[PDB]
Amino acid sequence: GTSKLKYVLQDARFFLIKSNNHENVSLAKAKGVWSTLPVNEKKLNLAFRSARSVILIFSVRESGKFQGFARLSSESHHGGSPIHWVLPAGMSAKMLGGVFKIDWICRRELPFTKSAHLTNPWNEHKPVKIGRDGQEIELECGTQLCLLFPPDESIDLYQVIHKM
Numbered sequence: 001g002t003s004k005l006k007y008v009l010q011d012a013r014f015f016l017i018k019s020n021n022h023e024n025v026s027l028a029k030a031k032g033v034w035s036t037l038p039v040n041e042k043k044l045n046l047a048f049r050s051a052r053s054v055i056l057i058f059s060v061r062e063s064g065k066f067q068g069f070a071r072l073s074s075e076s077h078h079g080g081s082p083i084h085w086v087l088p089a090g091m092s093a094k095m096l097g098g099v100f101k102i103d104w105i106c107r108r109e110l111p112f113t114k115s116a117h118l119t120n121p122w123n124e125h126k127p128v129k130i131g132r133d134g135q136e137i138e139l140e141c142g143t144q145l146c147l148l149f150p151p152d153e154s155i156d157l158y159q160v161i162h163k164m
């Protein structure tokens with residue numbers, strides 16, 4: 001069912017995450033962590049304090065799909081065991097130094113062809129698939145986007161609800 005999912009998404013904020021490679025999204029699914037560039041790190045830290053839930057919606061660039069979505073469970077933190085991100089050109093380990101803990105809500109894919117009816121008011125009402133890493137997605141668009149994903153029956157949202 002979808003009731004606990006809707007409860008988690010109630011009054012949530014949503015951010016598009018654009019990863020350069022599949023490797024880091026796979027690492028994030030395995031370890032429950034994400035790192036972004038400093039401009040987006042600051043925005044996500046502000047949002048984490050401001051809302052009941054901050055949702056990251058992941059898309060690997062050129063994949064034509066979203067790969068899932070997750071909820072921040074922490075602000076970014078440094079000094080952990082370095083996460084072995086595969087680095088794009090021009091991107092360094094120091095830039096990805098801040099580590100967010102995340103709880104996955106859906107690890108299933110959604111093709112862009114299935115979200116073509118959803119536009120994001122915070123990006124000039126372009127299709128929600130369009131946006132830079134870190135682009136915020138307005139509440140209604142983001143809620144409907146998350147509800148389009150196939151159900152992930154491996155996930156139990158009971159523990160996530162109690163973190164809100």
Ligand SMILES: CNc1nc(Cl)nc2[nH]cnc12
Pocket residue numbers: 018019020021024034035036037085086087088096133
């Ligand atoms: C682990 N974080 C990231 N990894 C990659 Cl491959 N690309 C990005 N663009 C913004 N953040 C990232």
